[PDB]
Amino acid sequence: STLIEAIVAREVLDSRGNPTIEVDVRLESGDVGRAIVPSGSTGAHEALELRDGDKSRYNGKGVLKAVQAVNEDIAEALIGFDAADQIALDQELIALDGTPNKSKLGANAILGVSLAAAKAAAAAFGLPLYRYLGGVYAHVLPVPMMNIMNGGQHATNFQEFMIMPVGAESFREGLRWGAEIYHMLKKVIHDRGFGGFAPSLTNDAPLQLIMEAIEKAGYRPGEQIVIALDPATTEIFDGYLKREGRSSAEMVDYWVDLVNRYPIISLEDGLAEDDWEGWALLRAKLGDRVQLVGDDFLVTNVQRLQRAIEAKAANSILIKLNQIGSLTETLSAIQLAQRGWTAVVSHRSGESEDVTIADLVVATNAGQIKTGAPATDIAKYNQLLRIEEELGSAARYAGRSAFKV
Amino acid sequence: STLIEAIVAREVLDSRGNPTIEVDVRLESGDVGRAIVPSGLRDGDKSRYNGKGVLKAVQAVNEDIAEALIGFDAADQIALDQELIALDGTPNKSKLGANAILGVSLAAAKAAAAAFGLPLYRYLGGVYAHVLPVPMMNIMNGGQHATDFQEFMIMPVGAESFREGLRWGAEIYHMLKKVIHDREGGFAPSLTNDAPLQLIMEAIEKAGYRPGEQIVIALDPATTEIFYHLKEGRSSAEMVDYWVDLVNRYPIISLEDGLAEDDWEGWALLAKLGDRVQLVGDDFLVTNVQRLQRAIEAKAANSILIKLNQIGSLTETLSAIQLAQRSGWTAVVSHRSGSEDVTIADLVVATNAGQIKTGAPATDRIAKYNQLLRIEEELGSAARYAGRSAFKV
Ligand SMILES: [Mg+2]
Ligand SMILES: [Mg+2]
């Protein structure tokens, strides 16, 4: 009944218009689960996604080989397998591959089947995905990290500036607050002549505009709205700031200063990718009052995570599904971090209409989600609205409790 | 079994982050149909989303519509839609809201399709629904913010399938970015009015494609927004002779709102090109049956842009599509500024419409393209891409 009867994949497009894999898992019950994998990519020591390299189709970005790995290899191995056994399924996919970075079948083919199987099974038990995945205690709505301003790589003259509606009584209220501030920040930028807005800018100017946008929308900094930053220090690191004309210990000094002036609750990649020495020093200085998130620093790798847990290098990790390659290994990484860091479930640049991360964040009661501006790549914000509604009296918005501060 | 048991609405966000209505219809079979209907019933409460809230349309669904339709057979689309029209009792669906009526109308069709275990295009169109549309892919912009002409679209007419045609357009979209670098939706760089066309023509041949034979241009100059003052410096009969010149030099297959909202004399004059070009009425027809029938007898255009949200119901939309089609015109189904809903992909195949205007290949737009890919695959051998057969010349 929850036994797999068919596995089929197809080449669809992502939010950037690039090919991506969509997997359908059909059970003996008639239930079909469908998953779209965020694509992205021939580099780095992490789970690798299979791209075609046929330059006569989508400039080599095709995904027909990952499609073939699903339609032939995975289908032949997994037809008759019980889809309700998530862990066993995932270890059957990992073993069928045989490579430590999912390079033979593709991390995109493995994740697609892993996610589609979970959805098929959820629909067979007649359960929503968050409940099927996390059981009876899945009820916490995350505080979103809402992108309102861009920079660095996307600037003309620190990469991301986000707002977090901590003070909201529900996700529905929190989303509205953030949407109202986003719309107000458009006016604030326009009446000064300049996912989120990326204009020519000091490094203090974006924080000032955001403070004005929070205030003019009618919200209280600190109490209601807080700032989460992703300067992406790996992008500006041969030992570090062109916008300020200056050149690891001194970078910490800049962050302590800024955190004391602005209501910054979280800082992601505040120090570079392999600057393990500096990361530990940043925790001793800010860790007690600021969330320090490892993105390029931890690359959702459990070995790097355990090293940073032991070294006391951060207190939060950014979780990316496509970097791990299976649902079981993602849940394992979320749990490892949580048992006392925060796990921040994040979307990808090459995302889709697929809303799995909205259910995954509630299933694990993660407390925080990292999505873009409230402007469809939105579907995730709508899923969280549907989940909060469905949970009724049982729903709880994380709020301040989202933070291990 | 297909009898309605519950009708539920909620306020969600649209692709612009504006509140919109999402309606769920539940049948006695346990099947649920869900639809998102973006707005152009608006709240006007300034202490919520700066008055753009849709709580009143949500209340119209959860109370008025739910009480009146619980127990109604969802499989009877026409009767359900005339029950909605009668409950509202206003010519422009102003009591309950067009968004409230469309939401229930679409969600009821989806609930019923799922109860019969049928994909929406087959449930809506029957056994002959199989024609994949030629997309009007927006690759270049102008006019306003989100040259004098608002939209520049490519059409992969020469493709053997929708899958192939989608790849062509996507490749040309990416190639045009590399050409703009060497000088909402499509690229909008400030610029001669012939330059966008020459840039598009360069991107076509640089991607490895042939104009006319494989790729054709479709235009939405939206001349109604400039009423003709082409502030090129120029200042109706001349405008007609201007488009004649373009068609002669460039592979333009279609022209939308080539003349003003109410320039009926000129619309009927452009006889001048009606024979070699598709002339689309957007602001000129505003999807109204009364105005559409007027332009049919007048021979003022040979195509109508279909906006589901402007019509308000599924039955009235199919009615408007059929009227245009059976009078020799093409019906071009179009998107809106505001969601993840992919109904128009199933609606375009259900009616074998041959063309879709759903924007740049970049989730609100991509989701519709993905639905068309799933539809083509599901049809298998039965599928047919319209190609040149999409056009009435
Ligand atoms: Mg990051
Ligand atoms: Mg138009």
Author numbering:
A (entry chain A): 2 to 41, 43 to 159, 163 to 199, 207 to 213, 215 to 250, 252 to 253, 255, 257 to 263, ...
B (entry chain B): 2 to 41, 52 to 157, 161 to 197, 206 to 213, 215 to 250, 255 to 258, 260 to 263, 266 to 300, ...
Paper text:
Enolase (2-phospho-d-glycerate hydrolyase, EC 4.2.1.11) catalyzes the conversion of 2-phosphoglycerate (2-PGA) to phosphoenolpyruvate (PEP) during both glycolysis and gluconeogenesis in all three domains of life. Enolase is a metalloenzyme activated by cations of bivalent metals, such as magnesium (Mg2+). In the present study, we purified enolase-1 from Chloroflexus aurantiacus (EnoCa), a thermophilic green non-sulfur bacterium that grows photosynthetically under anaerobic conditions. Each monomer of EnoCa contains an amino terminal domain that consists of a three-stranded β-sheet packed against three α-helices and a carboxy terminal domain that consists of an eightfold α/β-barrel; both domain features are typical of the enolase superfamily.
High-resolution crystal structures were obtained for the apo protein as well as proteins with 2-PGA and PEP bound in the active site. The enolase crystals belonged to space group I4, which contained two monomers per asymmetric unit assembled into one homodimer. The structure of the apo protein and that containing 2-PGA (2-PGA EnoCa structure) of EnoCa exhibits the so-called “open” conformation, where the L1 loop is away from the active site. In the beginning of the apo EnoCa structure refinement, the difference map peaks were refined placing Mg2+(I) atom in coordination with Asp241, Glu285, and Asp313, and then three water molecules in an octahedral manner. The nature of the metal ion could not be unambiguously determined from the metal–oxygen distances of between 2.4 and 2.5 Å. Hence, the octahedral coordination sphere, the presence of Mg2+ in the crystallization buffer, and the fact that Mg2+ is the natural ligand of enolase, is consistent with the modeling of the difference density peak as an Mg2+ ion.
